[PDB]
């Protein structure tokens, strides 16, 4: 029975209120993080989103969403902010231009949540990236796009791995810096996790941000479990070519769905990584029929299981569930292989990926570092971020000033 299968027990049968309407999503889940300027509203302002939310609520939009109808609600605000940014840049107001380009990028971003599954959402992805990089270019320490040649790609794969790159000042072959490789999630891509880069730069750490297969601009085959392996071979070849980066001090940090990829590459690329971190990742039970047949109605803001199916290149959930077992790090033998240093962190009560997958990760191969966060759901925030930064600071011998670093994340 499904109600007795997983750690959270009968919690999987209780539908979350935010699935009733956008009004319930805004009031019970999204308004607070929007006000606080945190995921999924990094770089964003409540001043931009509240008026849009008011118009969506008046229209009474709800599941099942028409994603073209949904996306269009955000475009007037996104365009308004982009025009304010363009005027500021022309006047030499660098700081103001940067702010409004990034505020524009945030509005485009939410219009194509949870993943671009319509023409207007695919449009919003391209528009979001354009204004993001315009804003990124006008930062004091500019974040740049690098189109890494996908030299390890095979037939049907893209020619480049587009990544964010930030190198601290005074980094050189003579004085090389560690690199945190951030692996993004199912809905948050390189334009979202970018919020972490200035913090790392301030601690003398380079950052590269790359998307998982079937998200953002990942060139990887969606249905091929080995496609991430090729992508990381291309990305790590490129990092090793950057002599200002110490390629003996590459730390991979996977966020949410990215955690699966961070855990996987700890095995596939052991000798090229100092450590990997899975924050709210899965490994095995995340691919279960039982888990996936319940997850659409739980803590995820939209349809988690359907979004996962799309990201893995399946036309519907049933087709994904029929083949999903082949992605398991247990089933495909990954977890039996030696791994580099691994840190697993998650909330016990996660209703996006089960904590049961931390157990599977700890039940196979070499010992791994773990922190469980009791009484917290997906990502075990906020303590998870302090746990991970404390550990990375010790690993890389940084200043250990993690409060100062975390204080830079909220948008203001
Ligand atoms: O900064 C963040 C915080 C989160 O809770 C995230 C969750 C999923 C993906 C990216 C995130 C980034």
Author numbering: 1 to 412
Paper text:
A common step during their assembly is polyketide trimming, which Afyg1p, Wdyg1p, and PlAntI catalyze. In summary, the N‐ and C‐domains in all three enzymes are oriented in a back‐to‐back fashion forming an interface that encloses the intramolecular binding cavity next to the active site. The catalytic triad is formed exclusively by the α/β‐hydrolase domain with the nucleophilic serine located in the consensus GXSXG esterase motif. The resulting Ser‐His‐Asp network is perfectly aligned with distances in the range of 2.5–2.8 Å between the active‐site residues.
